Design a protein around this ligand. Structure first.
Ligand code: 5X2
Length: 142
């Protein structure tokens, strides 16, 4: 097993889907409430950049969402790894998730999640371990 990966995918998965479907172990549940508060804050403050980036990505179907990976890696990894940019990575994900339910492609949400987790855990794995993973996440937005 890879429990940072499956915890990461569980949290990002349900955060994205509840964000698009309106709504809605113990560590995963505190991370998810943290990521509601912070997540919705960030989507409201970067909303001008977020819609700029959404419209420029132009996601229509699920082969779009599968292309997204390496532009994700590009925008995301600028070395100086920190929770702020991680949570922006997830929250933009949510932004995209609600836009995919608008155009009635909820089927792409879980691939999208599977991509975000996939970028995150594979590009920051050592940093995330050194910060005790999602317990670091929760206690950083304490
Ligand atoms: C699901 C998905 C997520 C993606 O995340 C990218 C990194 C997060 C991000 C920043 C960002 O990091 N901006 S920043 O350098 O000024 C920054 C760094 C730390 C805390 C707050 C802001 N600006 C953004 C503007 C628009 C969209 C996302 C961001 C990227 C892609 C392609 C997809 Cl398909």
């Amino acid at each position: 097993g890879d429990e940072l990966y499956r915890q990461s995918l569980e949290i990002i998965s349900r955060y994205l889907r509840e964000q698009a479907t309106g709504a809605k172990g113990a560590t995963s549940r505190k991370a998810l409430e943290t990521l509601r508060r912070v997540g919705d804050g960030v989507q409201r403050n970067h909303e001008t950049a977020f819609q700029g980036m959404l419209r420029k990505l132009d996601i229509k179907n699920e082969d779009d969402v599968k292309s997204l990976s390496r532009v994700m890696i590009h925008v995301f990894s600028d070395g100086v790894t920190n929770w702020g940019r991680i949570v922006t990575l997830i929250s933009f994900g949510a932004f995209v998730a609600k836009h995919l339910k608008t155009i009635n492609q909820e089927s792409c949400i879980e691939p999208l999640a599977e991509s975000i987790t996939d970028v995150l855990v594979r590009t920051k794995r050592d940093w995330l371990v050194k910060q005790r993973g999602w317990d670091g996440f929760v206690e950083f937005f304490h």
